[PDB]
C-alpha cells in the first residue's frame, strides 16, 4: 500500500496554503480526521461518524453535526505514488489531527527560516505496536528531521459508510460572497465577526432576502433587545426512530433563513478569511453550506474545494 508523497511550499504556494488551512480547520473541528488517498485526489474529512470521533458522543451531548470535506488535486504533491487494489486505488486512513498539525507547524517554521527543502511522506509498519501503521515524514533543515504519526487503516465496508452529505439543490439559495482580496473584503470580514462582540450570544439567525439584487442579515434575539445586522454592500447571487425534521412554512418565496451556532459561524469566518472565492448556500430551516473554491489553470486544472455543512441549531 505504497503512499509515497512529496510536498513543496516554494512551488505553487496556493496549494500549500490550501493544505495548511484544511489541516488547521480539521484539527480545530475534531480530534481525528479521515484521509482518503485516491488515484486522482486526496480527501480530508471531519465527520462525527468516524470511528474515533463517534466515541466522544459529540452528537448527543453538544450537537456536533457539522461535516467538513476538503479535496486536494494530486497536482498539489510533486510526487503522487498511490497504488492500491481497491476501487480507483483508494486507501482510507484515520489519523490524529494534533500530531499532523504539530508536524506541519514545524515545517512552516523551517520554511519561514529560509529553507527550501521538500517533505517526504510514506506509509510504514512500525514494529513497536484494523492494524495500526505509521506515517513516516522526513525533511531536511539547513540535518534530516524525521517524525512519525500513528494511523489506522479502514476497510471497504468502513470506507463506504462515510458519505458526503447531499443537499436539495433546487431548494437551495446560493449567495456569492465578496472577495476577501477586494475592496469590500474587510467590510464583510468585520460583518461576519460582528456578532462575536456579544459574549453571551450562542445562536445566530441568518436570513437572505431578494432585493446586487439580494441582501443578507444576521439576527440575534438572545439579548434584552432585538438585534439586527444588515449588509448593504454589493452581493451577487449564483443562479429505527429516525424522522424528518419539521420545516417551518416559508414567509415568502424569496426569503431563506436558518438558525445556527456561533462556533460554526466562527469557522465559516476563518474559511472566508482563508480563501478568495466563497459561496454561502442556505436551505430554509434546514442547513447552511460554506463552499470555498480555489481556481488554478494551465486545459483547466482541478478546482480545489472545501465544503462545510452546518445543520440548523434550532427550528424556525
Amino acid at each position: 500500500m505504497k503512499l509515497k508523497l512529496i510536498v513543496n511550499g516554494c512551488e505553487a504556494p496556493d496549494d500549500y496554503k490550501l493544505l495548511r488551512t484544511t489541516i488547521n480547520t480539521v484539527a480545530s473541528l475534531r480530534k481525528t480526521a479521515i484521509l482518503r488517498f485516491n488515484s486522482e485526489r486526496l480527501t480530508i474529512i471531519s465527520t462525527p461518524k468516524s470511528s474515533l470521533n463517534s466515541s466522544n458522543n459529540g452528537t448527543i451531548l453538544r450537537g456536533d453535526t457539522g461535516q467538513l470535506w476538503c479535496t486536494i488535486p494530486h497536482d498539489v504533491f510533486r510526487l503522487y505514488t498511490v497504488i492500491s487494489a481497491r476501487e480507483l486505488n483508494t486507501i482510507t486512513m484515520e489519523c490524529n489531527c494534533d500530531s499532523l498539525l504539530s508536524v506541519f507547524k514545524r515545517y512552516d517554521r523551517v520554511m519561514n527560516q529560509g529553507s527550501s527543502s521538500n517533505m517526504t511522506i510514506k506509509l510504514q509498519s512500525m514494529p513497536e505496536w484494523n492494524p495500526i501503521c505509521a506515517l513516516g515524514i522526513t525533511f531536511e533543515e539547513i540535518i534530516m528531521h524525521s517524525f512519525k504519526v500513528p494511523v489506522k487503516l479502514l476497510f471497504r465496508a468502513q470506507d463506504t459508510r462515510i458519505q458526503e452529505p447531499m443537499i436539495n439543490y433546487i431548494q437551495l439559495m446560493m449567495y456569492k460572497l465578496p472577495p476577501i482580496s477586494g475592496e469590500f473584503g474587510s467590510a464583510f470580514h468585520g460583518f461576519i465577526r460582528r456578532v462575536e462582540r456579544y459574549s453571551n450570544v450562542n445562536h445566530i439567525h441568518l436570513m437572505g432576502v431578494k432585493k446586487d439584487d439580494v441582501e443578507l442579515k444576521i439576527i440575534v434575539n438572545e439579548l434584552d433587545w432585538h438585534l439586527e445586522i444588515c449588509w448593504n454592500g454589493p452581493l451577487d447571487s449564483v443562479i429505527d426512530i429516525s424522522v424528518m425534521v419539521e420545516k417551518a412554512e416559508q414567509e415568502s418565496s424569496s426569503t431563506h433563513e436558518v438558525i445556527i451556532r456561533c462556533k460554526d459561524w466562527k469557522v465559516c469566518s476563518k474559511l472566508y478569511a482563508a480563501f478568495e472565492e466563497v459561496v454561502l448556500a442556505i436551505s430554509h430551516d434546514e442547513s447552511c453550506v460554506f463552499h470555498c473554491s480555489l481556481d488554478r489553470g494551465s486545459k483547466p486544472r482541478e478546482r480545489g474545494q472545501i465544503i462545510y455543512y452546518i445543520a440548523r441549531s434550532k427550528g424556525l
Binding site: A187, F191, R194, D224, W225, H226, L227, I229, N232, G233
Partner: protein, 195 residues
C-alpha cells in the same frame, strides 16, 4: 419614512453626551422619552425628590419628521440599562459610525435605534413600558415666587462640584446674598467628615 416619528443625524456626540448626563440618575431604572415637533426630550426622576430633563432640539438632527396627527406629542418609557449596553457595544468602533437614526411608530411599538455605517447597519429595538402614575411636571419651579436667581460659568461650578465630591461632602447649603455697590455673595457650604 412610514414611521410616525423619525429623526436622523450624523453627529454621534449628542446621543452619547445625553446618555452620560442621564447616567448619574441610576444605571438600572426607567427613562421617559417625549417626542414633539419641537424635538425629543429625555426625562428621569429619583425618589420623587429630583428630576432631570435633557432636550435635543430639531436643529440638532439633519432630518426630523413628526407625522403624528391625533396627538401633538408622544410619550414612551424605556430601560436605561438596555440602551447603555446596546450603545456601548455598538459604539465600540466610534470612528466608523456615520449616521444615527431614532424612530418610533406610536404606542405598542418598540423604540428603534439604527447605527448606519458605510456598508453595515445595526438596528436595535427597545421594548417600552407603562409610564408610572407619578407626574414629572409635579416637581417644577413656581415662576411667580422666585426667591433668588444667579448666573454662573460652567467651569467654576464644575470645579466646585468636584471639590465637594472629593471631600466626601454629605450636606450642602447654597447661600445667596446681595448688597449695595454691586456686592454679591454666592457660596456653597459643605458639611462632611472635614467639618
Amino acid at each position: 419614512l412610514a414611521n410616525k416619528f423619525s429623526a436622523s443625524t450624523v453627529h454621534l456626540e449628542h446621543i452619547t453626551t445625553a446618555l452620560s448626563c442621564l447616567t448619574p440618575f441610576g444605571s438600572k431604572d426607567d427613562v421617559l422619552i417625549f417626542i414633539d415637533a419641537d424635538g425629543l426630550s429625555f426625562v428621569r426622576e429619583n425618589n420623587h425628590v429630583i428630576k432631570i430633563q435633557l432636550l435635543l432640539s430639531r436643529e440638532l438632527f439633519m432630518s426630523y419628521s413628526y407625522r403624528n396627527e391625533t396627538e401633538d406629542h408622544m410619550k414612551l418609557c424605556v430601560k436605561i440599562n438596555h440602551i447603555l449596553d446596546s450603545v456601548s457595544v455598538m459604539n465600540r468602533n466610534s470612528d466608523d459610525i456615520v449616521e444615527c437614526t431614532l424612530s418610533y411608530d406610536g404606542h405598542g411599538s418598540p423604540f428603534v435605534l439604527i447605527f448606519e455605517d458605510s456598508f453595515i447597519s445595526e438596528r436595535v429595538e427597545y421594548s417600552t413600558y407603562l409610564i408610572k402614575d407619578f407626574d414629572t411636571n409635579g416637581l417644577e419651579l413656581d415662576r411667580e415666587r422666585i426667591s433668588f436667581e444667579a448666573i454662573i460659568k460652567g467651569e467654576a461650578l464644575h470645579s466646585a462640584l468636584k471639590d465637594l465630591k472629593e471631600i466626601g461632602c454629605k450636606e450642602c447649603y447654597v447661600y445667596a446674598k446681595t448688597e449695595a455697590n454691586d456686592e454679591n455673595v454666592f457660596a456653597l457650604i459643605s458639611k462632611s467628615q472635614l467639618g
